[PDB]
Design a binder for this molecule. Structure first.
Ligand code: W5A
Length: 167
């Protein structure tokens, strides 16, 4: 048993809910929240800007020290940093940004990072302002992640579309 509530079950291991990932993290305090990061860990908008704002910018301060030491992530890569006030850990995962001309084939590599964690609260990678088709992102998630993933979709209209179209 875990503390996640109100999720639709898609598969053996994938669950989904219409909720802001920020509001879900505050309520659950999961072991791992996934950030939809970029390679610079510059948390401007989408899930990164919203998560970072909820940490009072502590996520960005920690992230800048990480980049100063290690350099940028790879597209498709990740790093584990603090979850601050939202979670034990934040897994910063870089999905391809379609709008940036980033290769969509890297989305599977991005979701493979989730398999290093038994349970995660996560957004749909490369969706929203990263420009990918969210229906595709959900399919790659279900076909790639083997650990237990609780997906938060903030947009009501997108949630209803993802559920109705899910095979
Ligand atoms: C770059 C990306 N944006 C989203 C959409 N999205 C944006 N803002 C939030 N606070 C969200 N919580 C859940 N999903 C959210 C997915 S990936």
């Amino acid at each position: 048993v875990n503390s996640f509530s109100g999720y639709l079950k898609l598969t053996d291991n994938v669950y989904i809910k219409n909720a802001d990932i920020v509001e879900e993290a505050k309520k659950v305090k999961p072991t791992v929240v996934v950030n939809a990061a970029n390679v610079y860990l510059k948390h401007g908008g989408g899930v990164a800007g919203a998560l970072n704002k909820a940490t009072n910018n502590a996520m960005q301060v920690e992230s800048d020290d990480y980049i100063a030491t290690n350099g940028p992530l790879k597209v498709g890569g990740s790093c584990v940093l603090s979850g601050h006030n939202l979670a034990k850990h934040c897994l910063h995962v870089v999905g391809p940004n379609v709008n940036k001309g980033e290769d969509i084939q890297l989305l599977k590599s991005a979701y493979e990072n989730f398999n290093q964690h038994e349970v995660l609260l996560a957004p749909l990678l490369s969706a929203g302002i990263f420009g990918a088709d969210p229906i595709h992102s959900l399919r790659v998630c279900v076909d790639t992640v083997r650990t237990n993933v609780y997906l938060a979709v903030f947009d009501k209209n997108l949630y209803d579309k993802l559920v109705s179209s899910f095979l």
